[PDB]
Paper text:
Symbiosis between legumes and nitrogen-fixing bacteria is dependent on the Symbiosis receptor-like kinase (SYMRK). Nod factors produced by rhizobia are recognized by the LysM receptors NFR1 and NFR5 (2–5) in Lotus japonicus (Lotus), and these receptors subsequently transduce the signal to the malectin-like/leucine-rich repeat receptor kinase SYMRK. SYMRK is the first component of the common symbiotic pathway driving symbiosis with rhizobia, Frankia, and arbuscular mycorrhizal fungi. The SYMRK receptor has an active intracellular kinase domain, and mutations in the core kinase domain have been linked to loss of symbiotic function, showing that kinase activity is important for root nodule formation.
Author numbering: 580 to 745, 754 to 877
The structure:
């Protein structure tokens, strides 16, 4: 069950917050270790994404109830001396972003069967959120750095600081934001589906969504890849490191799904439940490339 921690316990566990992993919605994340030796990621208070005890209480009740094999589980929390802290298990294989085009991608290549299994698991975690009993939970910042990988490379969707049960400002992450958002002023399940479509193109192509260091025609992954997909020239966008390591039909159905996720108008995008079923069939096909 979820554990309450004192601010002192978190101080020892993080060793004076020495080891910083990054910054998120809820705040900065530090690496820690519990008394039982469990490695944890410790997310501490950010001023802009915090209010008080009452607001943190509903967020805490939500995160505790969200349980699924493809979501990072909440292990514990600290609310003491005005510090709001969330404690998650440490995912030792990092993010999908790191494995595609970060530092680990320099040393080793994520093969296509592992990539397809990661897409399916991430889609299953997102579908669980969209069908959460009582009230659908929108992630609202889906992206490849928010898909973490455990020791067996199973995907776990992370980082629900922006999540909420289903004002105009900057939202999402550059490259992933629903193209209708400034016309609707709302993020919905179908906004999450658009962002997941970008993730699928990252998985297929090995490329980040935006890169001004590429030639101008290649600056944007979505805009670059869409004409090849529609022109039955999918091999032109596939990551060179996995060329020849994929079953043709498995790859075609994955990019077909990505293309529907990327539809500019929300009602044409599939549900996450429909995306799971397509990726499941694609994974079967790939496994039968004997």
């Amino acid at each position: 069950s979820i554990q309450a921690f004192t601010l002192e316990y978190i101080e020892v566990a993080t060793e004076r917050y020495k080891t910083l992993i990054g910054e998120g919605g809820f705040g900065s994340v530090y690496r820690g270790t519990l008394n039982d030796g469990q490695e944890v990621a410790v997310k501490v208070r950010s001023a802009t994404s915090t209010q008080g005890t009452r607001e943190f209480d509903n967020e805490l009740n939500l995160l505790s109830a969200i349980q699924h094999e493809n979501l990072v589980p909440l292990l514990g929390y600290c609310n003491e001396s005005d510090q709001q802290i969330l404690v998650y298990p440490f995912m030792s294989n990092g993010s999908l972003q790191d494995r595609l085009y970060g530092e680990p991608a320099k040393r080793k290549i994520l093969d296509w069967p592992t990539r397809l299994s990661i897409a399916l698991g991430a889609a299953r975690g997102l579908a669980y959120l969209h069908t959460f009993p009582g009230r659908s939970v929108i992630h609202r910042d889906i992206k490849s750095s928010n898909i973490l990988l455990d020791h067996s490379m199973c995907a776990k969707v992370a980082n629900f600081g922006f999540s909420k049960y289903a004002s105009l400002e900057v939202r999402g992450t550059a490259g992933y934001l629903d193209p209708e958002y400034y016309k609707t002023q709302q993020l919905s399940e179908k906004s999450d589906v658009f962002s997941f479509g970008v993730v699928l193109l990252e998985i297929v192509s090995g490329r980040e969504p935006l890169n001004i260091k590429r030639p101008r025609t290649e600056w944007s992954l979505v805009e670059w890849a869409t004409p090849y997909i529609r022109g039955s020239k999918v091999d032109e966008i596939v990551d060179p490191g996995i060329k020849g390591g994929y079953h043709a039909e498995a790859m075609w159905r994955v990019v077909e799904v990505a293309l529907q996720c990327l539809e500019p108008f929300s009602t044409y995008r599939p549900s996450m439940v429909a995306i799971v079923r397509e990726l499941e069939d694609a994974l079967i096909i790939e496994n039968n490339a004997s």
